Every structure is written in structure tokens, then in C-alpha cells.
Amino acid sequence: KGAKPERGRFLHFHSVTFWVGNAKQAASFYCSKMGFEPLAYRGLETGSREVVSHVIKQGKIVFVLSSALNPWNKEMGDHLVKHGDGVKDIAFEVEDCDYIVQKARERGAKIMREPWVEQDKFGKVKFAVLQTYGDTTHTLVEKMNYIGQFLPGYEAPAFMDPLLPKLPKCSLEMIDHIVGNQPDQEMVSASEWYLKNLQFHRFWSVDDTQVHTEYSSLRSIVVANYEESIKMPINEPAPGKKKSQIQEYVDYNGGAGVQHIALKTEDIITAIRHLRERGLEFLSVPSTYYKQLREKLKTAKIKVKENIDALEELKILVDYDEKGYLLQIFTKPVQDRPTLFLEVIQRHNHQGFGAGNFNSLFKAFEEEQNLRGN
Amino acid sequence: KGAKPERGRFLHFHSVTFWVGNAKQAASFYCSKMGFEPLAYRGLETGSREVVSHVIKQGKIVFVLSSALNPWNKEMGDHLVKHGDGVKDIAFEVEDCDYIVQKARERGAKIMREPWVEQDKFGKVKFAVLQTYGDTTHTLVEKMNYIGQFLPGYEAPAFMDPLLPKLPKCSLEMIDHIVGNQPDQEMVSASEWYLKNLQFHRFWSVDDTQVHTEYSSLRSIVVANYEESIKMPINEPAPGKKKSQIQEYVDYNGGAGVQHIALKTEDIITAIRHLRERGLEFLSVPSTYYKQLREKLKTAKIKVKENIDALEELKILVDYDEKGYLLQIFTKPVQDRPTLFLEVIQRHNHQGFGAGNFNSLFKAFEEEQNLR
Ligand SMILES: O=C1CCCC(=O)C1=C(O)c1ccc(C(F)(F)F)cc1[N+](=O)[O-]
Ligand SMILES: O=C1CCCC(=O)C1=C(O)c1ccc(C(F)(F)F)cc1[N+](=O)[O-]
Ligand SMILES: [Co+2]
Ligand SMILES: [Co+2]
After folding, report:
1. Host domain of residue B36
2. Taking the CB of the first residue and of the last residue of chain A, which one, N or C, has fewer CB atoms within 10 A?
3. A249 ligand 1 Cβ < 6 A
């Protein structure tokens, strides 16, 4: 949706690396309650004596849970005391890594790790780490004739949970978008980091055409690579009807970081029905939200293929324009700090993110409080 | 048995408080994989703005998973960088909290928190915190006409996991014992801390009537309150045929701490089948252990009521003497660091702790090696 970069390409999201206090229990949690399955493992049993990593997978989504094996680890320890459990690195699978790293250096980005190559019998892979907002980093993955299962240096998982095969499939397929919350007046600079250093462009959608700040208490700029396969909204607090939840994140995260990861699915009724069966908790939606959605769809230009009675019981939200609609629902925070959560989304010819639900939910709670009093 | 202390009494284990990086997911793990159920909760929704605690319960066992809510917490943060996830506090429900604290301070104990009282709609409870080995502490709880579900300041859990009722129950009843590993030459001071300051006594068992050091690589002093409802073995590394795992625990924990918690069941066959169905992992036991077990039982004075074929499939261990036997099995470490693990035990007139299995497993692993 802009100009074309001469060299390099960002294929898609490769993986999301979490830095958690207990990688064993973290990988167990995401497998039990979000439909992930063990893929690879790195730890003491494999020769990695300082850092353990549990690799889990569902569809094309790859999560990495990592913890420190020895005491007095400063880098991982400070990150855990500062943020708690949260996202550390967002990986991009790229083509022509050497130009992307050097052109990013020419534009003034901090190269945290110079390009290096790891190898096993299955091929070679090139990596490189750049620093973005807060302590969040971006690792670049370039497969150079690599054929293995995941990456070199990871063996078969340490343990295969026999409970996972008996649990219903959640049908989560790929990562749609990853939102990074920024502190005050840092949305523009953080969004410029990708346009400047990685030659991204601002992704425009129907959300950019409404003033939702009075109901959202946030400002948002969506940034995307050239092919628009990687989309990452960048948020910052804004004044609004209520105190900004972007500020609540920054206060509890200790700075900038990933607010939520969005996972795209093609069957959100099956996905949410099975995720709730596995025990995952989602946001509360009042009954008046679906009382109002039925009246809206009588005058809307589109028809929803999904059953409205099913959406009401599963507490799934809907946002539409004149040409399509999307279905979305958000989990409760996956930790105790009101920081990181996750989102399940299904798209029906709609490139938005649900900004219309800030006004929709405000009207839904408005009738509910109007009922309890008037 | 002994001479009853003048005043005061230690009723039983109250609870075990963990200091973990994610109290939400930690409480989910013990509920999903060990048969616990949400009991009470403390957090931002309840007014507790600095420490979040998910309280879970199974039988009489009560675990408390706690984390820090605000960034840059020094004490909980340093404990997390040093130990990782592990036990922080072992609580005792006591009678006459004020004298137990007064006698402990008089005998030289470090009182971390003086006796204080909290009160809600269900009654009053008195607390006191003592420091024991390493960074582990001991909270004394005294119920003074409290009738509520747990303790004041805790309300109904934030979320009732809808998957838990669909999972089979694990039939774990109570905490049998809690073991604390000490470095070399600190077993005596740590174990004597309880006899001196709390008027505990040394608990002796059939394990103590033999020397198992060449196969266990550890020394142990088991401490118990007067009523012997609270048992806490205190370990230290000792030279032996293999690398001391009591030493490897201290190396990865940064000092003394709780090595494992033991949970008692009255049906270990059902417990282990359901724990394995829920996804809990246990230690590997070679098949030659059960070939040798059936040969030992042809001569033993006792008869094991449980199916030997079931013990072999579930990888449960057996230790017996001339008057009874116990069944036990150990989980893999509940973290990636080889520090804390857990044990499930069923007792059939046997007051030991399984010291004979070090020798039994060593001979079993040796026969597997020569037959490969
Ligand atoms: O996808 C992001 C893009 C930036 C703004 C942010 O609000 C979007 C979230 O997905 C989103 C969308 C809607 C809602 C609502 F209104 F339904 F609550 C909430 C969020 N959210 O969790 O930030
Ligand atoms: O319960 C403790 C008491 C102190 C000594 C210790 O060995 C006891 C453990 O339960 C125990 C018993 C047996 C084994 C064996 F030999 F099977 F590995 C291991 C442990 N243990 O993990 O401490
Ligand atoms: Co989103
Ligand atoms: Co034991």
C-alpha cells in the first residue's frame, strides 16, 4: 500500500518467545488451555545448560517458553522482576537477512546481535536480533536450505503430555496481529521505528476513519510490512471517558511491551466452544450487547453467517462495515498483572481490528446500568 | 511419644505457600495436573494491590501460589531470580500462638513478624512468622472462632476452571511430610532449630536402623511436633556411589530449601492412574525393579495387598520391613531446574520414608545396564 523496497522480504511471523518464570508450567498452560502441542525442546538433556526452552505449536503459530536454569541470571531475572511473564521477542522469517540487518543499521537501529549461523544435519539457518520498544526484541530467521522440524539445536520434546490428545482441537491457525503498547507520546516514535528501520508502511483500515478515543482511551497506528503479511498495531494512552488501559499496562509492565497476540481462525464457534471446554477464561459481555446487535443487523448491509444465539452464549464480539465483518473475543489476562492477554479473531472480508466495539460495549453497559436503576 | 510441652500445641499442616513467577498459571498447573480445586483468592479485585495469591485445596492439602503484582519487587524478585518457583512458607495451625512465639524468641528464634490479628465477617485468626532454614519461613495460624472457608481477606476464587470437574479425582488426602535440603554440616543446626525453638522431637523410624548413605548420598534427621502430625525430614549431602542429588539441589536453589512435598493417599493405584491421565509426569523405574520385587516378596514377612502388576504399570515403588510396607512414587521436577518435586505415598503400617529404595533402585539400574 506504499512504495517497494529493493531488497529483502519479511515472509511472515516465525515465532513468539516468552520469558517466563517456569517454562515447564507455562508450556503446559498454553498446551492445556489454548490447544498447543509440544514441538521441540532445548535444555539440560540437550546440552543447553543455562537456558531451557519449550517449543509448542498449533497450526503455524509457534510459542517459545524460556526460563533461566542457573541462579543469578541478571538479564532474564531483571526481565522477570520488571515485567513478570510476558513476550520477549517477536520473530520474523525473512529473505535476504544481510541487507535487512545492514539497512536497519544505516537507519540507526541498535543491532543487539550481529548475524550468526547455526547448523545441524538438516541445514543452516541465519539469525539476527534487533531491539525495538522496551525490552522487546525482533529476531530474524533466514532458512538457508534448512529442512528440519523447527530450528537447529532443538531436539524432540522432553515430555509428551498424554492429556493433550484427548482434548478438543481449538482450530487456531496463524498469528493475525501483535499489539505493542507504548507509554505516553511514544506511539509515533515506535511506529516510525518500523517504517524507518525495516521499511514498513502504515496499514490503513476502516478503524483509522473513526474517533473512538472517547470510548477507547487509546491512540493506534497499525504498521505492516510491504506484502502486509505482518501487521502490528502500536498503541499509546489517550484521554477518554475512562482512564486508559494502555496506561494500566505500562504501569504494570514497567514500560513498553506486547499487549496481546491475535490468532486467526476459520471456525470461531468451534474454537471458542473448545477453548472454554479446556478451561480458558474470556472477557465478560453483558446481555445488552446482543440485544443491541440484533437490532443493528436488521438495518445493516451485511448478513452474519454465524448463529447469533451461539455468539451470545460464547460471548464473542462482532464489528462490521459496509463490505464485511469480523468476529473477535479476548481472553482474560494470562497472568495476574493486567498486562498480556490474547485474542481470537475470524475475518469475513474485513481488515479492521474491532474499534467499533469500544462504542458498542459502551452502549451495551449503558443500557445495563440504565436497567438496574431506571 | 515423649514429654508433652507445657503450653501450646501444633495441630497439623495448615498450608504451603509458593513464591512463583505466575501465580495464575501455577495454580492452574496444580489444579489441572494434581487434582486440586480453587478455594480462595487474593488480588487486585479483592483490594490486595501488592501481592496476588491463588489458594487451592485438595482434601486437607492447601497450596498457596503467590506472585508480585508491581514491578521491581525486591524481596519476591530476588527470591525468584535466586530460586525460581519454589516453596516460600510452611504454615502450621497452632493452639496458643502467643506462647509458641514467646518461647521461640526466648530460645533464640528469629521472629519475622510479631503476632497480629486479622478479622472479617467469619471470625478472627492470629498469625506470626518465623524464619527457618534458608529463605523458608514458618507462619503460625491460630483460629479463634473462625468459621469461614479459609482465612480473612480471601473471597471466592476469581475463576472456577470448567475443565476440572471433567477430570478424574486423585484421592490425595493430607500432607504426609515436607523435606528441606541443607548444605553440608547444616543438617544438625536446621533440625535442632525445631527441637530447640518449637519443642519438637527427633522422629526415628525403621529407616534409621540401617546405613543407606552409600546409595542415598544423604543424611536425614526427621523432625516432628509432639503429636507427630507434622513431620519434616532435614537432609544434607553425604558421600555415596553417585552424585549427591541433595548437593545438586543446593547448587540449583542457591542454598537450603524445600526439596519435595509428600501427599498421603488411601488408594495410590487410583491416585496414580488419574494423575497420569491428567498429564503429570513421574520418574522412570526400570522393569528389573519389579522382577526383583516379586522375588523379594517370595520371602518377605508381609503380604502386599495391592496388585503387583498395577504397581509395575504405574511405576510405583515399594519399601517394606518385617511388620508392614509403604507405597511411594515421585514426580519429575515441577520446574526445569532440578529443585522441587513431589511425592505420593500410601502407608500400610509403616512409618518409614522409603530409604531402602536407593539400594533397590541401584541394583535394578545395574541389572538393566548389564543386560543391554
Ligand atoms: O487489535 C487492536 C488494534 C489497536 C487497538 C486495540 O483496541 C485493538 C484490540 O484488538 C481491541 C479491539 C476491540 C476491543 C473492544 F472494544 F472490544 F474491547 C478491545 C481490544 N483490545 O483488547 O485492545
Ligand atoms: O521422604 C524422604 C525422607 C528423607 C530421605 C528421603 O530419601 C525420603 C524421600 O521420600 C525419598 C525416598 C526414596 C527415594 C528413592 F530411593 F526411591 F529414590 C527418594 C526419596 N527422595 O526423592 O528424597
Ligand atoms: Co487485536
Ligand atoms: Co519423602
Report:
1. 3-168
2. C
3. no
